[PDB]
Design an enzyme around this catalytic site. Structure first.
Site, PDB file in Angstrom:
ATOM      1  N   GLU A  35       0.901  -1.419   0.013  1.00  0.00           N
ATOM      2  CA  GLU A  35      -0.046  -0.013  -0.219  1.00  0.00           C
ATOM      3  C   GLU A  35       0.854   1.263  -0.069  1.00  0.00           C
ATOM      4  O   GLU A  35       0.306   2.329  -0.678  1.00  0.00           O
ATOM      5  CB  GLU A  35      -1.121  -0.119   1.243  1.00  0.00           C
ATOM      6  CG  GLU A  35      -2.123  -1.032   1.031  1.00  0.00           C
ATOM      7  CD  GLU A  35      -3.178  -0.747   0.002  1.00  0.00           C
ATOM      8  OE1 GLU A  35      -2.930   0.274  -0.725  1.00  0.00           O
ATOM      9  OE2 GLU A  35      -3.983  -1.517  -0.243  1.00  0.00           O
ATOM     10  N   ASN A  46      -7.612   8.758  -5.697  1.00  0.00           N
ATOM     11  CA  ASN A  46      -8.435   7.612  -6.538  1.00  0.00           C
ATOM     12  C   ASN A  46      -9.041   8.357  -7.544  1.00  0.00           C
ATOM     13  O   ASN A  46      -9.533   9.601  -7.575  1.00  0.00           O
ATOM     14  CB  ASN A  46      -9.340   6.949  -5.304  1.00  0.00           C
ATOM     15  CG  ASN A  46      -8.575   6.310  -4.305  1.00  0.00           C
ATOM     16  OD1 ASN A  46      -9.209   6.545  -3.242  1.00  0.00           O
ATOM     17  ND2 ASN A  46      -7.698   5.532  -4.396  1.00  0.00           N
ATOM     18  N   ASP A  48     -12.185   8.192  -8.297  1.00  0.00           N
ATOM     19  CA  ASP A  48     -13.518   8.831  -7.865  1.00  0.00           C
ATOM     20  C   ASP A  48     -13.507  10.183  -7.363  1.00  0.00           C
ATOM     21  O   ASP A  48     -14.474  10.789  -6.789  1.00  0.00           O
ATOM     22  CB  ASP A  48     -14.313   7.842  -6.927  1.00  0.00           C
ATOM     23  CG  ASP A  48     -13.820   7.915  -5.532  1.00  0.00           C
ATOM     24  OD1 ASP A  48     -12.849   8.202  -5.261  1.00  0.00           O
ATOM     25  OD2 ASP A  48     -14.578   6.993  -4.624  1.00  0.00           O
ATOM     26  N   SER A  50     -11.780  10.639  -4.382  1.00  0.00           N
ATOM     27  CA  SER A  50     -11.161  10.317  -2.898  1.00  0.00           C
ATOM     28  C   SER A  50      -9.772  10.283  -3.035  1.00  0.00           C
ATOM     29  O   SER A  50      -9.204  10.263  -3.962  1.00  0.00           O
ATOM     30  CB  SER A  50     -12.009   9.300  -2.458  1.00  0.00           C
ATOM     31  OG  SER A  50     -11.618   8.299  -3.000  1.00  0.00           O
ATOM     32  N   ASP A  52      -6.302   8.238  -0.546  1.00  0.00           N
ATOM     33  CA  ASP A  52      -5.910   7.109   0.493  1.00  0.00           C
ATOM     34  C   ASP A  52      -4.766   7.979   1.066  1.00  0.00           C
ATOM     35  O   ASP A  52      -3.940   8.364   0.461  1.00  0.00           O
ATOM     36  CB  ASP A  52      -5.480   6.003  -0.477  1.00  0.00           C
ATOM     37  CG  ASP A  52      -6.819   4.945  -0.965  1.00  0.00           C
ATOM     38  OD1 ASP A  52      -7.817   5.503  -0.851  1.00  0.00           O
ATOM     39  OD2 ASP A  52      -6.150   4.145  -1.747  1.00  0.00           O
ATOM     40  N   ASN A  59      -9.062   5.199   2.859  1.00  0.00           N
ATOM     41  CA  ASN A  59      -9.698   6.185   2.059  1.00  0.00           C
ATOM     42  C   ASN A  59     -10.786   6.982   2.655  1.00  0.00           C
ATOM     43  O   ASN A  59     -11.546   6.802   3.447  1.00  0.00           O
ATOM     44  CB  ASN A  59     -10.554   5.098   0.785  1.00  0.00           C
ATOM     45  CG  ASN A  59     -11.204   5.830  -0.016  1.00  0.00           C
ATOM     46  OD1 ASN A  59     -12.562   5.964  -0.067  1.00  0.00           O
ATOM     47  ND2 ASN A  59     -10.553   6.364  -1.016  1.00  0.00           N
TER      48      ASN A  59
END
Ligand SMILES: [Cl-]
Ligand code: NA
Length: 129
Positions: A35, A46, A48, A50, A52, A59
């Protein structure tokens, strides 16, 4: 802060992740590796809109507030910036909520694609735990 592998394993153990919801420590270390590369400051946008955050790439769509993710939730009740601290307490506590949601560690796409079904104990080999 960029953790060493065994340093992060020790911190995650102290904060109660070893066998949390049945996931051995190696699963968590493997997840953090893929990650964040064990970097508490890691951030990634991301598609969309958002973002992380942190060592486990939590998220803003659901878990934290970063002031710029419309129509999202803050189920861990924290600013996303708390997840970038050198101290992993906030990340670990939020991770516990995530993994309890019903999908277990499948919530972490890197875990499902790179750790699940592998010899994850290799991630803590050598470590004084
Ligand atoms: Cl599960
Ligand atoms: Na949010």
């Amino acid at each position: 802060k960029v953790f060493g592998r065994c340093e992060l394993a020790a911190a995650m153990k102290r904060h109660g992740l070893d066998n949390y919801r049945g996931y051995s420590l190696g699963n968590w270390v493997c997840a953090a590796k893929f990650e964040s590369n064990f970097n508490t400051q890691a951030t990634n946008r991301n598609t969309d809109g958002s973002t992380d955050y942190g060592i486990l790439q939590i998220n803003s769509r659901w878990w934290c507030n970063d002031g710029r993710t419309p129509g999202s939730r803050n189920l861990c009740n924290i600013p996303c910036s708390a997840l970038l601290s050198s101290d992993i307490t906030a990340s670990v506590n939020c991770a516990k909520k995530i993994v309890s949601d019903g999908n277990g560690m499948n919530a972490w796409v890197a875990w499902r694609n790179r750790c699940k079904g592998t010899d994850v104990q290799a991630w803590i080999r050598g470590c004084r735990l």
